[PDB]
Design a protein around this ligand. Structure first.
Ligand SMILES: NCC(=O)NCC(=O)NCC(=O)O
Ligand SMILES: NCC(=O)NCC(=O)NCC(=O)O
Lengths: 358, 352
């Protein structure tokens, strides 16, 4: 089977980790029956500097017309507004219909402290990220600003459905015989209904109603958790969570909190998922302090590729990637500076490849 | 000095830890020169079964210099007539700052931390201004208003600097601290909320200029997401943290998770002429009335309240007395892995 994959390295260590991932993809075992054709695409801060547009329209056109999926590196986002610049990643997610931001956090077997195997499913189109704000009073010393938080039944139902689909997929993997810390599947709905009774009420009702949309979701357990005690429980008993579904802001904050459970950010994967497309993306940024020195950790990117392949229906390939990656990490011989080692990007790519062909 | 203290034990273990704290206050050693008058007030879930009687408010305004609140057994769903009494108390008494010290005991298991989350407690999304703007079956759309004002944000900013200054003075009096330098970290998400969070940031930065003695305090700015990430890994990097309402709520609960038992974590709601101490733990229905609740969070919230009332001496010796018991490890409640009751640990602190 053929996958046409858009490659969008963008900036800094994006330009090192995406070629690493291409090498991984090109060299998957024959048993997977998976070939890739790649298309190189331009986006990011460097694209903005050269052309005045962070996301060329041609890049979006090729994605929609040629590609089955994409891999995005990292954008060197400015720290203030720049005229003519807008985030190409936020733009690509909107333009490609990628409404779900999926962030799995899974500890290594034999890791210290509480084990974790959870997935945060973050609604990624609305809430406060509609960016609709006004300075309603401009009195010197007494300004008043207001922002709109918007929650819709349609978007919330869609994200709830995606959570149940993910829960169902994880449960099938368990039932196929792969060990899991969870004995029962669970979707935990995150909210703050005691303050946001109308908006979070809608979010909650919509996610609960999503369970009714397919008879195969009926077996999945559902509960609800207030956001603040969710952070409390995340740090102390993260083993209690399977699939967690949240509106945009709570999901953003919880995903970043959960990333802390597994050590270096160069280990943390993500995918942006829509109904007809998926874009993998490592959680780390462009790391300009180390860009060009051949020491970037490509593990987050590898796991992001594997996550993408999970959503595309290549469970076997994904599982072998995860196993090969974890073996490198547990063995602890080949480690990049962010892992406390002295090894380079290419050394760790070679190590993953050596394991996958074992 | 004489303090008139409203006692609002409200629900569950609130009914046990508040009497424990009353006793402590009655037994404050002569050298602190501090006596209390106590007034018993009614509020909470039991009080509803109205959550907050008007009498309670009237008495706070006109008789009390401070107050101590236990815990409300909050329901899991909405109830006609019922609105949170602790939320209404804070607004009525003008308690704009929610203050949560998270401080590990020297030698305790767990990650060293010594920070205070200073949470703006009046606005942001908590203005509770929502509307179902589209009501079409299947296609509903709801909206809420997040409001950030320069005046509220400057005020919480100023409070954060006051607390940073007061903590630096404690260090310089000879109390050991994991911090060599005072720091205010301003929390925001201005890459998403450019206008509202931009105003919060500007206002807190400007609050530094309100007292010349703050110029010496280091200031930085951190995105709420990174801050949650950093709390788990390197909480020792933070001193005073100032945040708008929602980010403050999430961070205070993230920070609290660092301490082994919630029975050790205090808080105070602070306004310009009033303070109300309040333990962080809930009403703990499933140990209530068994005489084993941990009163330490309550003692430390009393201690916190005393600091804000200008009794650093009293507060120090409560912290020292409480710290001493905890470090001996002889008289500990079950949540600390011990076998002692509420009254026995109160006795133990009283002994110091
Ligand atoms: N792949 C990580 C990355 O590019 N980070 C920079 C950025 O601006 N990300 C957008 C976001 O936080 O959603
Ligand atoms: N003392 C903590 C407490 O009462 N928790 C229950 C609760 O819902 N309190 C509301 C709040 O403190 O914000």
């Amino acid at each position: 089977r053929r996958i046409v994959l858009g490659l969008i390295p963008a900036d800094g260590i994006g330009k090192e980790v995406v070629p690493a991932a291409r090498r991984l993809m090109e060299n998957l075992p024959a048993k997977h029956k998976l070939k890739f054709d790649f298309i190189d695409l331009d986006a990011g801060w460097g694209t903005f500097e050269r052309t005045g547009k962070a996301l060329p329209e041609r890049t979006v056109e090729r994605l929609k017309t040629e590609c089955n999926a994409a891999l995005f590196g990292a954008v060197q986002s400015p720290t203030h507004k720049v005229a003519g610049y807008s985030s190409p990643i936020v733009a690509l997610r909107k333009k490609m219909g990628l409404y779900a931001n999926v962030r799995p956090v899974k500890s290594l077997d034999g890791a210290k402290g509480k084990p974790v195997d959870l997935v945060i499913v973050r609604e990624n189109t609305e809430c406060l990220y509609v960016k609709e704000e006004r300075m309603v009073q401009n009195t010197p010393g007494k300004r008043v600003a207001e922002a709109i938080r918007r929650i819709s039944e349609e978007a919330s139902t869609k994200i709830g459905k995606m959570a149940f689909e993910i829960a169902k997929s994880r449960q099938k993997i368990r039932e196929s015989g792969t060990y899991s810390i969870h004995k029962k599947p669970l979707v935990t709905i995150i909210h703050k209904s005691n303050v946001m009774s109308v908006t979070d009420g809608l979010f909650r009702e919509s996610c609960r109603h999503a369970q009714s949309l397919d008879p195969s979701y009926a077996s999945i357990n559902v509960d609800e958790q207030i956001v603040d005690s969710m952070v409390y429980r995340l740090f102390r008993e993260p083993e209690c969570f399977d699939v967690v579904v949240a509106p945009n802001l709570y999901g953003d904050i919880l995903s970043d909190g959960a990333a802390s459970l597994i050590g270096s950010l160069g280990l943390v994967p993500s995918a942006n998922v829509g109904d007809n497309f998926v874009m993998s993306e490592p959680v780390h940024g462009s790391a300009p302090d180390i860009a060009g020195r051949g020491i970037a950790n490509p593990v987050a990117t590898f796991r992001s590729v594997a996550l993408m392949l999970e959503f595309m229906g290549h469970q076997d390939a994904a599982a072998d990637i995860y196993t090969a990656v974890d073996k490198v990490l547990t063995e602890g011989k080949v480690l990049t500076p962010d892992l406390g080692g002295k090894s380079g990007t290419n050394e760790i790519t070679d190590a993953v490849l050596a394991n996958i062909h074992n």
